[PDB]
């Protein structure tokens with residue numbers, strides 16, 4: 001049967017181009033709300049209003065930091081004084097602002113729209129924030145987990161911006177100007193480039209009227225047209241093998257595979273869902289392969305396999321702590337060589353599909369998951385997204401399709417093997 | 424108004440003494456179930472059936488490991504093949520077994536009762552598991568976070584078993600015998616010493632009948648009488664200051680305060696709730712003290728203040744990463760010296776009460792929280808526990824009571840300051 005959620009999903013588009021999705025769930029105390037923009041760390045270059053721009057790295061994340069500045073509000077206290085709290089993040093391809101709370105939802109939604117739809121930059125506070133971000137960048141270059149990850153990306157990618165960390169570099173952050181920040185904010189923070197998604201214990205009629213009234217009272221420009229400009233990234237890694245020494249107390253191994261290109265909308269949903277099942281079957285905590293590695297002390301319970309897919313890039317990562325990183329790397333390559341020769345085992349595949357169907361069903365209980373995922377798939381091109389779309393891929397996915405995905409993507413020539421070794 | 428939950432809470436006691444609480448929430452896909460025993464790492468000594476016993480440390484946790492052994496089941500696969508997964512933990516004063524899943528809840532509850540109500544020990548598999556636990560103990564002595572924590576406890580406590588880690592030592596684990604394990608299992612795993620709590624998308628009439636039928640078909644002994652035997656722990660620390668060097672990349676500071684004794688039931692609920700509010704007001708992420716420490720680079724966002732209270736002990740812990748551990752320790756003591764002289768600031772206190780009321784209200788949305796907390800407070804003596812009890816303490820708590828709690832407990836003579844310094 002097609003997925004029937006127990007609650008209403010109300011999705012419409014405002015006069016100013018903003019898409020809104022409300023999921024009222026009256027039995028819950030929490031409301032969780034997210035306002036996000038289709039703009040992230042990888043949007044280095046773009047054309048808008050007839051001109052080509054190439055920015056220093058770091059702008060999406062700089063704007064995130066500065067979004068909370070307001071001469072007429074402590075933004076965090078405005079939420080907190082009325083029973084909610086607010087946070088944000090920047091990722092590769094979107095920036096998100098979100099709160100959760102238990103009452104006065106009308107006020108909080110108003111505050112969320114208001115603080116994201118105005119920016120307050122001065123030459124002074126742009127200078128101040130550069131120092132704060134440079135420091136954050138230095139600290140994060142000393143974090144071993146983040147370092148191993150960034151070494152893999154740097155090895156994998158020749159030119160794609162994903163090879164630079166989300167905050168940028170010290171050099172690039174230092175070159176950012178107020179003018180650039182304002183250009184990017186005006187270009188990407190238009191409501192036509194954004195999405196507002198809310199789930200939990202709120203009155204949908206009440207909140208829908210508050211949003212319309214808030215937006216109707218503001219004045220927006222014509223929507224900017226954006227041509228996204230990205231390089232022709234080679235399908236092979238820049239370096240296929242890397243190791244380095246770092247003050248870590250045990251070795252760490254990361255093996256990755258590079259997608260030749262990104263994906264959009266329903267294609268992205270299908271490929272992402274298919275990898276979730278495949279990686280669980282190959283590497284998951286209930287796989288005989290994982291149990292054999294654990295029994296042999298080659299991994300610990302923090303071992304994981306993850307997939308990341310966006311419009312202009314994608315990759316698989318597998319690994320974790322590895323007392324014998326060479327041995328673990330060999331076992332992974334052997335495992336894959338056998339599946340490559342012999343085909344995916346059907347029984348492991350059906351157990352995986354059933355685990356992931358359950359995991360998704362249970363996750364649809366959570367306001368945060370419902371919201372985050374509606375936002376994420378919408379902005380990545382599923383303009384009419386529905387969770388039934390995910391469930392339906394989980395139901396209809398086949399062993400042939402699992403084999404084709406494996407053959408396409410988990411290969412030797414698009415693979416990077418990288419290690420961090422104790423100093 | 425007294426708290427009204429949106430769902431039914433059905434609490435009764437079976438013929439064999441087991442207390443069951445079901446919280447059906449029909450709108451949810453997940454059911455989360457926990458079967459726990461009032462027995463943990465600190466129950467080193469006890470009297471039962473007319474005899475005094477003193478055990479080697481480690482038994483609660485040894486039984487946890489061995490509970491999953493079954494000649495007629497892969498216990499994990501029994502849950503997994505029908506859309507659930509199972510795990511367990513041992514803590515100071517209870518051991519818990521739990522699953523979450525999306526269907527065939529009747530089967531899973533049956534499997535949960537069945538695998539916890541029989542144990543399958545052999546001289547052989549007791550030997551095997553000793554090696555596995557000794558290794559786990561060695562690994563955990565090399566984990567810096569766990570090490571700093573255990574150094575604090577070892578400094579704080581003279582004789583109380585809480586000073587030994589949950590798994591015991593290599594020596595004590597090695598002295599454990601099958602006979603002892605069986606004695607502790609027979610004594611503490613009787614249904615009269617346990618609790619079963621289930622929340623989520625299940626039929627309460629269906630599951631209540633399955634539980635009664637499962638228990639009615641088994642044969643239980645007369646409930647063992649247990650006299651809990653614990654030492655007269657001094658109210659002052661064994662050592663009030665400690666530092667050590669460890670392969671860590673930044674220093675870590677932990678400051679703790681020792682309760683003179685533990686608490687029971689409604690007294691424990693009140694004191695635990697009161698500390699949650701107080702610690703947030705003193706040290707929380709929205710406190711001016713915390714913001715001043717962060718602005719000065721004396722802490723990072725992993726800084727935290729936590730409270731632990733049980734029937735026979737309790738303590739407060741505050742700290743985290745500390746680039747200047749001496750300076751941070753001084754600032755904490757100064758902060759507390761001013762509040763000690765001047766009284767708790769009322770405005771910070773009301774903001775804290777409102778944050779924690781919200782946090783609790785939002786947490787009551789979660790099957791896992793509802794279940795874990797019902798279990799925990801019940802086993803610690805709130806024999807008629809209700810979440811309204813917690814909410815009511817949050818509503819009625821006063822500034823005078825916050826000052827009295829502070830004066831009683833956050834003092835200089837029951838305080839331990841400890842640091843781990845980079846090698």
Ligand code: NA
Nearest residue numbers: 067115118119
């Ligand atoms: Na703003």
Ligand code: NA
Nearest residue numbers: 490538541542
């Ligand atoms: Na068992």
Ligand code: NI
Nearest residue numbers: 061065136167
């Ligand atoms: Ni940042």
Ligand code: NI
Nearest residue numbers: 484488559590
């Ligand atoms: Ni263990």
